[PDB]
Symmetry: C3
Subunit: 149 residues, 3 copies
């Protein structure tokens, strides 16, 4: 079943919104399958974000993501990548639909609560970069037969 | 005053979301005027979903809606039919706006939490099919003068 | 830093939603900088709503806004005017996005829970009309460095 990588960013951690953000992911029907609070080492940050190395904001993005712990997640469900992006909302919290994590909780592009993989391909990369096979569990849940048919 | 038929579906029931869903209906200003927890008899399911008799998904719909109790509702308010459809969101929870019942709580089209009448005529038909007039109460509420002009 | 004027209307007050609405404002990252529960004098209502002095709905506007206390607010943050309008939602709660204050809480245009300044000009205008300089506080908050760069 499809998986994506989500990460609760240091702004959410420092605003004490960890539980609230998990709750929104959970209630949507997505299954938390891996999860760890962690300080992000500099090279993880640079390899996770290098698409952006050239850009002006780059050195701010790296400083921010390493400034306090993040909550790294692997999340499972039918169409999980797009589902996550859907409930997370647009990159810019002022464009993100009310009701979405970024729409309800964030102000600025740079401080936008959470990260989600933008595609199937980057999901498998991101999951691989952040987690080892043995940190990601597999389990049936009571609601599974009620989420899907 | 306008009325529509809503039904909390077995997925929501089995996921223990009854209160949450009623809360969203209630806080919107809609007045719960009829409500019952019920097992759906096969015939009621078939006549309720009659339009879909021919379609591939039909049997699955009938099995699903009869698999565990639903919470059947009559709800009252200005423009109730449309208001309900608005807060419920698009049929497909992945298209439904974040903040809507389906947008926040559902994953798949077949397991999408709640039903709402799609029009005025199907509202009276569904109300009639699921409830007897003596099951539908009428009452003034303190907030009525504050919801409307 | 940018400021706008918000006012929780008497329908919201009389529906006991004051805390709920403040919570939505608060969690978005906006900083409450002035706040007062107040009966609106006729004099203020008429000048506040002076644009509409010719229109059919005008008297109803004035009656309604003076019919019970409102909670008047000055709210601060980057792009605060548009950020407030965004989480408040469209004038008509049936057009407002689910997840917005109006989309989740209101039914009719006339009874739509909250007001927010429509522009920078009228923010400045409304802030001045409703509050005195000494009623609006200025303060740093712990989360400020985590909302913005």
């Amino acid at each position: 079943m499809e998986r994506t990588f989500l990460m609760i960013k240091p702004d959410a951690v420092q605003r004490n919104l960890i539980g609230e953000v998990i709750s929104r992911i959970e209630r949507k029907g997505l299954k938390l399958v891996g999860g760890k609070l962690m300080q992000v080492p500099m090279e993880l940050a640079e390899t996770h974000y290098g698409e952006h190395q050239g850009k002006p904001f780059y050195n701010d993005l790296i400083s921010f993501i390493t400034s306090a712990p993040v909550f790294a997640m692997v999340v499972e469900g039918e169409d999980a990548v797009n589902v996550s992006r859907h409930i997370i909302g647009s990159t810019n919290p002022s464009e993100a639909s009310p009701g979405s994590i970024r729409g309800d909780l964030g102000l600025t592009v740079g401080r936008n609560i959470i990260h989600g993989s933008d595609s199937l391909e980057s999901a498998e990369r991101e999951i691989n970069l952040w987690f080892n096979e043995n940190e990601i569990t597999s389990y049936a849940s009571p609601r599974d037969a009620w989420l899907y048919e």
